[model samples]
Target: STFSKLREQLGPVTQEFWDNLEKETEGLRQEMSKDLEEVKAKVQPYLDDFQKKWQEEMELYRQKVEPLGEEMRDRARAHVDALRTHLAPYSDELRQRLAARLEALKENGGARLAEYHAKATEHLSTLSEKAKPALEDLRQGLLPVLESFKVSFLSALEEYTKKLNTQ
Candidate 1:
């Protein structure tokens, strides 16, 4: 099935990305949690000095900014999920085309070898011509997807920073 072929090509990459995301997010969350705790610690004295004003201002700030942070996180998550979904089908097609090309080459070996004695012979010419273009097409087709992924990744990081700044 198409899904099985797709999984064979893309599953590892998908899993790796997800795993890396999990590790990175976990580290970020831990670091942010620590930083917030430190901020709280540092502000405790001020809070005590001006308890009513600090509490009121901080509460208002949280009420205003928490939703923004949540929205940023949601948007970033959706972008990543969309990128992965779009890549899966293309990855599958590329894999299938490559495998088919290899099989054709294997099947054509006998006739190809027969023509080897005539240097620069026309034997298997169609396959030879098709091979290079097929490879180039694969390369070219995947390049934009990869570039888009990189852009999305950077954008997600930027969004996270923006959220952090707002917080």
Candidate 2:
């Protein structure tokens, strides 16, 4: 810009001038360091509090979701139990019909009918063989997700905390 006096018009700088400039700069350095410490002291706690609150909110979020999760699981079981409970007569009717039909067949069938009925009755009484492996597959599919949820959600929680603290 504009200057009332050109820098060239000033007399040459001497050793005393340089010494004075050095002293002034050293005092400025002291002021600057003090300012830096104060900013650190104030800002650190603010960011630390932010991180603390962030972590707490994540925990709250995880907790809030559990009640709904519990409701959904309970509701699914309730549906299954309700349908089975209400419709049990159908199963009973089927069993009764099957036994009556089989008896009627036994009365009119060939000479080997007794052995055929022995095998058929034995097979119909238990479903453990046909259902055992299928039940196991459901078991494996249904392994609890709670602990697994903790791991992944906690991983994301820590990640969020770090970014909020700006580390």
Candidate 3:
């Protein structure tokens, strides 16, 4: 195949291209790693200092506030229990009304959701129908570009073929 012939002709050039690319990327990788190490070394001490200070501060605050928090919790529990007992008589009817209302909402909401879902499907199909011509137009627009690409590729190949002729 002519492809095999081109591969033989371009082998050294292709190897050189890849070799330069690999060398450049390796250098870049080493440079980036060195920068990262330097940046980490510079920032690590401050991070450690902040961590130690923050831990000490947090422990101090916890120790100072924990007893007060416990007392508040106990008082809140007592108040909640007393309120619950006082309100116990109305709880059954309230719960019944809430359950009925929630049931009604679910039925109504489900119907509305189904209606919206149908509408969405209808709209999507309409959009797809409208897009058929537009999609054709898009391909038509690309036709010139595709033709130009074919011309450019052939032109370049012909130019390179002449170079091969000279050798």
Candidate 4:
């Protein structure tokens, strides 16, 4: 049922196409790695900023919810970690394919460019769709736990926000 949901989200044809692409691009792993590295480099700063903001948010949420149960915190963290582990391998493969495709586009010109763009867009769209259900589930399931955390966290944030506004 879970995979069915995922497959429906991904669309069978798109999944097959990606599978084929990965097979074809088998030798380009290093290129893909390089591309991933470059992307990571570019994205790290933004990710760092987000992490800071997210930690601040979580701290506030935790303060509010801690009284509810530590189990909530434990479960939420476990779920997030599990999701990350489940997705990581596939994400790595997808990232590599994407990087290789991009590299090809940069080095080649003409029809290949158009073809690559279309394929890339389709692949990304499929990937996004595949990820949507999991993300939605996480959001829906985790919010209540987070809100529980919010009992303490929210109060903290509110006070912090008020202080910032006053300044």
Candidate 5:
């Protein structure tokens, strides 16, 4: 399928040429052969670099994410353990005082905060409505195309390696 395209761009190599790869490894190096080897040589270094780049990026990400994950869990555990004890003193009549203080604050900044909560909820509702179509488009439209491209591109990569193996 692909070799026909190669035939267009670089002219043709015979099935016989491949079968006779050993014979004309010493045979006059055709331009097609030269181009083939140039592309073929790229497969390994390109793959090696891609693999190395993935690992490097993965380690960087792991370093970033792992610590944050641990810290959040640790903080939550500590908060859960300590919060009740800290609040135990305030659990009595001070709780009623806390309520009175709460009402005092609620008249000022707390009222603004409550309005902000309502305003933000409406904003998010609008955002959620707006986001749904794009999310569906990604899941329903883009993902399938990306999946097919991945399969086709990897298949082409395999064909490249197989060609090199034959060489």
Candidate 6:
């Protein structure tokens, strides 16, 4: 079901891209071929750019998680890793460095560092809360593809929040 799942996961992103494309190209609704290959060709560059953006954001978050403990670092890396793998393949070297950075951080415990973790936790909670409303449109179903994606994404976010609370 890998191919099926990948296509399903791409629905929201594809919908957004196609909507934008339609607006830019007048009469595109009539001109565009609805064939799978043709649509895939039209969408590939946008998906590539989105993947690039996602990887950049993951790198930024990975940096934020560097100051935490080994387990926390691993958790953060694994979280990004799974998402990355779901989206595309990633090398293991960066993940290994995440662990090393944690080891380095664990060796020293400063008041500033302790204070940072508190801020990080608070920021994370805020991030989690903001997502609830972002996914609110799912219930309305203006777009079925987006509705499905939002529901699945919100559930995953909830699990992420639960993990954050427990730790």
Relative to the unseen true structure, what is the C-alpha lDDT of residue 106 in candidate 6, on a scale of 0 to 100?
79
Provide TM-scores for the models.
Answer: 0.24, 0.23, 0.39, 0.25, 0.30, 0.20
Write one digit per residue (lDDT tens) for candidate 5, span 48-164. Answer: 999999899999888977898789888989997798787787687687998889888868886788889999999999999989987888778777888899999999999766664
Which pairs, if any, clash in model 1? none
Residue-wise lDDT of candidate 4 within 37-90, one digit each (tens)? Answer: 999897979788889998988987877678656877788899989989978897
What is the lDDT of every predicted structure here? 0.80, 0.78, 0.85, 0.82, 0.80, 0.75
Backbone clashes counted, model 2: 0
Runs of candidate 2 exceeding 4 Å displacement: 1-72, 110-167
List ranges where model 1 is wrong by over 4 Å: 1-7, 48-167
Model 6 residue runs over 4 Å out of place are: 1-107, 110-113, 138-143, 146-167
Q: Of 5 and 6, which scores higher on lDDT? A: 5
Cα RMSD, model 1: 30.2
lDDT by residue for model 3 (24-72), tens: 7888888999999998997889798889998998998788678878788
- Taking all chains together, the TM-score of candidate 2 against the true structure is 0.23
TM-score, candidate number 1 = 0.24
lDDT of 2 at 52: 97
Error of 1 at 33 (Å): 2.7
Tens digit of per-residue lDDT, candidate 6, span 48-81 = 8889998988887777666566678788899988
Ranking of models by TM-score: 3, 5, 4, 1, 2, 6
19-121, model 2: which lDDT tens digit per residue? Answer: 8899788898889999999999989798989999989989987797799778888898999898898679888888899999999887768756887898888
